Amino acid sequence: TTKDVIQKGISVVGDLLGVVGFPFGGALVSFYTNFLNTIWPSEDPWKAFMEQVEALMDQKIADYAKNKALAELQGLQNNVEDYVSALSSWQKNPVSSRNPHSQGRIRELFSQAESHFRNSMPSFAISGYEVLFLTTYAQAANTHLFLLKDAQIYGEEWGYEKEDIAEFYKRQLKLTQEYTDHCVKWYNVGLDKLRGSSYESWVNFNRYRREMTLTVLDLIALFPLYDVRLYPKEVKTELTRDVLTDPIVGVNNLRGYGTTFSNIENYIRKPHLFDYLHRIQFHTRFQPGYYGNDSFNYWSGNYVSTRPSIGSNDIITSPFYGNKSSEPVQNLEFNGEKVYRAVANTNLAVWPSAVYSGVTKVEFSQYNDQTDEASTQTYDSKRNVGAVSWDSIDQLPPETTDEPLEKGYSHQLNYVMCFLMQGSRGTIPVLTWTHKSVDFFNMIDSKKITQLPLVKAYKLQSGASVVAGPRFTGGDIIQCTENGSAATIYVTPDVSYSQKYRARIHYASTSQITFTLSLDGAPFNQYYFDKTINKGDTLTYNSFNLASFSTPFELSGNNLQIGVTGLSAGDKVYIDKIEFIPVN
């Protein structure tokens, strides 16, 4: 259910990934037309976003608050549409028809929309309804900020005063911090409100977490890239966070046999360096039916193997999950294949005073980006398979319904974990996914500013570790507590000639520090960096700083190592991303 808003959410993020940083005029206008058709066509989408959280929270917005919100949104729609039509004409029209008279038309259409946004935002954050208005606020906030950056692109062309463009920029910086912080604060409020002890509690908790990730968290992660002054070129970036699909179960009500909240939540994958699905070992067991005729085999447990990020080849194999096989083991390999879909069959046997159900068949759809072709691999219990009851596409829709699935999908399989039901009445499989934007090769683009998340490293050292991200960076981060090396990340240059680059680092630190960069073991850059937080502070938007290294360099190697020094006992440094700026 609610796949509609989930698709809109996934699509917007997918489209924005193409116009992030300083976009080319034609691309910007193209985006805007889809944007209007997706998010700003009528009040239906906004109403659906409200109902979405109401469904997750099992609460409703007071009708008065709901009606006003919808009213503001209708007005904002007109402002956005009037603005886009005009912007479209401006881009299309040559630098000749641009007379003082048309400049003032676009200038006031823009000022109106921007102003209307600041006036309306409070309506999507009324006391007591903050969490329920979250996806609506997120989408409105996004629009407001995306709109704002246009003033830095076309400001002078439109004939705005130097003072005006500057006021708009400072306003953009203030709002990027506020909107981001607002979303994370209430996201967490909602998350905690759903924590329970039962299996049913965890499904709700995790569904909220996944849906808020796709519609809110992924979105706010892009906000900083709207700063066309800091990002004067197109930006190549990726979202590294995990999302778990709903558990695969054959029955709607488990009558208390579902795995407990803590036995699921405490065992799912913890903050880890990025990796890829490599192999799966299926274990099968026989489930007898009370009358023999109604028996079936089912997936009882599993092993999972993943390969690390580029630069390392040693395969990581998971502990055993679930119950050992009573039947012959099945192994599926994925070497390089991208699993973009998983469809499952489940079956049930009704006993006098018990019901037994399990996953009997799983069909995986894979795409080989090397040999540009799709195919399927499947697990079959072999005895009484039943019907399909679970489709990943329902939870993780494609970015585009235009292209074929192997091209338009939004996520790929990263992990499989089997949980045991209470009193071991069965097995509950849980699947973890990662975003399609993740570049396996860690490729440094020669024309764009490339953002490289530290979790893409293949090797951590000196006691460095992966820590939960602050919810606004698109993924997890690296925590450094000691002086010395920290991480080694493998890099793939996209060109052959001696292209030069400048490096920038997005970090947080409790003290003044020194970052050192090495290529294949040789230092090439070392610089001093400011303290951004106090010991014990929680990480909010302003905790992070983005600072450049002085000197330019060439990528005469592949193994980039980041080292830190200047730490004292109790000092901590958090590293989010390293950026590469193509320089002449």
Characterize 72-88 residue by residue with b for buried, 16 or more Cβ atoms within 10 angstroms of its Cβ, and e for exposed: bbeebbebbeebbebbe
Helix (H, G, I), strand (E, B) or coil at 243: strand
Pick left, alpha or beta for residue 470 (phi over 0 → left; psi -120 to 50 → alpha; otherwise beta): alpha
Whether residue 92 is found in the same domain as residue 166:
yes
Largest interatomic CA distance in the chain: 86
Helices 162-193 and 199-212 meet at what angle, rounded to 10? 170
Alpha carbons 346 and 325: distance in angstroms, whole number: 18
Alpha carbons 257 and 281: distance in angstroms, whole number: 25
Contacts of 428 (CB under 8 A, 6+ apart): 247, 248, 249, 258, 259, 418, 419, 420, 421
Q: How many domains are there within the chain?
A: 3
Q: Which tokens go with 520?
A: 């294949």
Are 297 and 284 in contact, with CB atoms under 8 Å apart?
A: yes
Q: Examine the fold and report which residue of 229, 252, 284 is the final residue of a domain before the chain moves on.
A: 229
Any idea what the CATH number is for the domain that residue 353 is in? 2.100.10.10
Handedness of CA 45, 50, 54, 56 (dihedral sign): positive
CA angle (403, 408, 410) in 5-degree steps: 160
Alpha carbons 116 and 83: distance in angstroms, whole number: 12
CA angle (405, 36, 209) in 5-degree steps: 60
Helix (H, G, I), strand (E, B) or coil at 55: helix
Whether residue 87 is found in the same domain as residue 128:
yes
Q: Which tokens go with 354?
A: 């018990």
Contacts of 263 (CB under 8 A, 6+ apart): 419
Alpha carbons 46 and 40: distance in angstroms, whole number: 8
Whether residue 377 is found in the same domain as residue 523:
no
CA angle (582, 236, 170) in 5-degree steps: 85
Length, in residues, of the chain: 584
Indicate the residue type of 14: G
Nearest to 49 by CA among 12, 95, 103: 12
Residue 386 has φ and ψ, to the nearest 5°, of 70, -160
Whether residue 284 is found in the same domain as residue 402:
yes
Question: What kind and span of H or E run contains 199?
Answer: helix 199-212
Whether residue 84 is found in the same domain as residue 184:
yes
Are 302 and 321 in contact, with CB atoms under 8 Å apart?
A: yes
Method: X-ray
Are 575 and 477 in contact, with CB atoms under 8 Å apart?
A: yes
Q: Which tokens go with 160?
A: 């705005």
Helix (H, G, I), strand (E, B) or coil at 409: coil
Helices 134-154 and 100-120 meet at what angle, rounded to 10? 160
Whether residue 296 is found in the same domain as residue 177:
no
Q: Which tokens go with 490?
A: 């493998």
Q: Which tokens go with 288?
A: 């007898």
Task: Tell me whether strands 513-519 and 559-565 are parallel, antiparallel or unpaired.
Answer: antiparallel
What range defines the domain where residue 520 resides? 230-240+438-584
Are 357 and 250 in contact, with CB atoms under 8 Å apart?
A: yes
Alpha carbons 83 and 77: distance in angstroms, whole number: 10
Whether residue 46 is found in the same domain as residue 147:
yes
Resolution in A: 2.5
Are 308 and 316 in contact, with CB atoms under 8 Å apart?
A: yes
Residue with the two structure tokens 């028809």: 97
- Which residues make beta-bridge pairs with 492? 443
Whether residue 293 is found in the same domain as residue 172:
no
Task: Tell me whether strands 449-453 and 235-236 are parallel, antiparallel or unpaired.
Answer: parallel
Q: How far is CA 419 from CA 38, 453, 482, 528, 539, in A?
A: 38, 31, 37, 48, 33
- CA 458 to chain CA centroid, Å, is 20
For residue 269, the 8-state DSSP code is P
Nearest to 242 by CA among 280, 202, 279, 274: 274
Whether residue 275 is found in the same domain as residue 394:
yes
- β-sheet with 411-420: strand ranges across: 242-244, 427-435, 411-420
Q: Examine the fold and report which residue of 411, 437, 463 is the final residue of a domain before the chain moves on.
A: 437
Burial class (CB in 10 A: 0-12, 13-18, 19+), 336: middle
Are 366 and 405 in contact, with CB atoms under 8 Å apart?
A: no
- Which residues make beta-bridge pairs with 563? 485, 516
Whether residue 133 is found in the same domain as residue 184:
yes
Pick left, alpha or beta for residue 103 (phi over 0 → left; psi -120 to 50 → alpha; otherwise beta): alpha
Whether residue 219 is found in the same domain as residue 117:
yes
Are 311 and 488 in contact, with CB atoms under 8 Å apart?
A: yes
Nearest to 574 by CA among 434, 489, 468: 468
Any idea what the CATH number is for the domain that residue 109 is in? 1.20.190.10
Indicate the residue type of 381: S
Whether residue 533 is found in the same domain as residue 446:
yes
CA angle (139, 164, 19) in 5-degree steps: 40
Q: Which tokens go with 426?
A: 């069965």
CA angle (30, 34, 40) in 5-degree steps: 130
CB atoms within 10 A of CB 252: 5
Pick left, alpha or beta for residue 319 (phi over 0 → left; psi -120 to 50 → alpha; otherwise beta): beta
- What's the count of helices (H) and strands (E) in the chain, helices before strands? 11, 27
Alpha carbons 490 and 561: distance in angstroms, whole number: 9
Q: Examine the fold and report which residue of 202, 229, 256 is the final residue of a domain before the chain moves on.
A: 229
